[PDB]
Design a protein around this nucleic acid. Structure first.
Ligand code: MG
Ligand code: MG
Length: 476
RNA sequence: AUGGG
RNA sequence: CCCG
């Protein structure tokens, strides 16, 4: 987005800190080229002449403005996509009660009880539990108030910046490219959930190519479903974006909200409203306050869904802007935020599409390494989605999500103190799909010290997961 | 944060 | 814990 004002106030906002990621017995062994993002203005690993505070905000390099024409084309695209979505999900989009919004519903997890609460709550020690009752799903007075203000389109707030504490490729660490998290007020999350919760649950329950969304999928079971679909197309593209979330422009965001979340579709009227407040935001970094236009903050209830919907719309728009006669079935896709797979029997020129995405502020490039541009004829077994390949399970015949050994090695090499056992068990569910040899190599460093689930047991688990009759079958 | 799983 |  575009930073329209870096104001400065004494009232400081504490984030800094050391990393919670400690190396494991495995690191020595795998020597990953990844490490914990720099979290300190002066980390002893930051290339000379780097200012975290600098790099970290070097993502706001503008807010693309659209012509009346391009805007009119984008509104058609969003209306065309909204027609498809809601035709599939239905129009059962009524607001959630505060109870439903808190405790979740079929397809929508419960709000989280002890995560950051946002502001001004942060500045008083207060936590969500001191504001909300996740037991019965009722809210305390401050939140009661905020809501009535929101119902009265009169509520203002600020995002709170955290430096994401995660593992990263050394080159990005040594460059100060640490990612940031925007924590919204816990009441904003509540009210979004209220306004767009049931729609969301429906999105999750109907995840798939038909709506172009994989939010709520479970790769273990759904890979087979996703793979067979995309395997039927002549062309598949692994399209990458660059700072997708930050480069959504006010025009696009505003127009999407207006077309997809209309009352004619059964949404409360403040559905559009609460979403729009995401367009221009104030971020609080330590002592600094910062106004931005464009982009989408990371911790908004519905960030992944919003992103996914934009992603679908961008593709329709880019294509319509270059070709004639493009409709929703000229192609197929599924996305999860910025992550996307597209496919078509038409020989679409994504390379040519590149300027059209540019009109929206979006830069696309091919996942396929830094290759010489988009090419034709790629297959589903050539792409990555959610950091997983689609490989054929040479046993069940089913697709399975295979992660790159390198990635698993970086994953296994670092861990929060006193979380290693559970981390190992959880990462083993990812690694099983790399086959028994790679599975055993990956975990040897932990042998004799931690409990490593047998490859065998996780394979049996996965078969029953992916297809119980497959499982039941292996036994007839 | 988010939201999935 | 892991992915966007
Ligand atoms: Mg990307
Ligand atoms: Mg990709």
């Amino acid at each position: 987005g575009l930073i329209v004002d870096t104001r400065d106030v004494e009232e400081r906002v504490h984030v800094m800190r050391k990393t919670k990621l400690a190396p494991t017995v495995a690191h020595g062994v795998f020597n990953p080229e990844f490490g914990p993002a720099a979290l300190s203005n002066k980390d002893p690993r930051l290339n000379e002449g780097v200012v975290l505070d600098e790099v970290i905000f070097s993502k706001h390099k503008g807010d693309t403005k659209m012509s009346a024409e391009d805007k009119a084309l984008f509104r058609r695209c969003a209306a065309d996509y909204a027609s498809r979505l809601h035709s599939v999900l239905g129009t059962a989009n009524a607001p959630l009660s505060i109870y439903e919004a808190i405790k979740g519903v079929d397809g929508l997890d419960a709000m989280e009880p002890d995560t950051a609460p946002g502001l001004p709550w942060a500045l008083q020690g207060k936590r969500r539990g001191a504001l909300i009752d996740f037991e019965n799903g009722t809210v305390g007075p401050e939140v009661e108030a905020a809501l009535k203000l929101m119902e009265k389109r009169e509520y203002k707030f600020a995002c709170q910046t955290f430096l994401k504490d995660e593992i990263r490729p050394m080159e990005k660490v040594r460059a100060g490219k640490t990612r940031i998290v925007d924590v919204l007020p816990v009441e904003h999350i509540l009210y979004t959930r209220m306004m767009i919760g049931r729609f969301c649950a429906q999105m999750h329950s109907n995840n798939g190519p038909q709506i172009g969304s994989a939010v709520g999928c479970n790769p273990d079971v759904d890979w087979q479903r996703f793979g067979t679909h995309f395997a039927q197309y002549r062309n598949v593209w692994d399209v990458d974006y660059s700072a997708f979330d930050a480069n959504h422009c006010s025009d696009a965001m505003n127009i999407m909200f207006e077309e997809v979340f209309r009352t004619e579709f059964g949404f409360h009227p403040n559905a559009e409203w609460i979403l729009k407040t995401l367009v221009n935001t104030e971020h609080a970094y330590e002592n600094k306050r910062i106004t931005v236009e464009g982009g989408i903050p990371s911790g908004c209830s519905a960030t992944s869904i919003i992103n996914t919907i934009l992603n679908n719309i961008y593709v329709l728009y880019a294509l319509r802007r270059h070709y004639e006669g493009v409709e929703l079935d000229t192609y197929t896709m599924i996305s999860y935020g910025d992550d996307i797979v597209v496919a078509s029997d038409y020989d679409l020129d994504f390379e040519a599409l590149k300027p059209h995405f540019k009109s929206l502020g979006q830069t696309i490039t091919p996942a396929d390494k830094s290759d010489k541009g988009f090419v034709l004829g790629h297959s589903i077994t050539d792409v990555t989605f959610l950091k997983r390949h689609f490989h054929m399970d040479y046993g069940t015949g089913f697709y399975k999500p295979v992660m790159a050994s390198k990635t698993l090695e970086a994953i296994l090499s670092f861990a929060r103190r006193g979380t290693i056992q559970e981390k190992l068990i959880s990462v083993a569910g990812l690694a099983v799909h790399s086959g028994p040899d790679e599975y055993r190599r990956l975990f040897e460093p932990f042998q004799g010290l931690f409990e490593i689930p047998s490859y065998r047991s996780l394979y049996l688990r996965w078969v029953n997961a992916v297809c119980g009759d497959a499982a039941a079958l292996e036994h007839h």
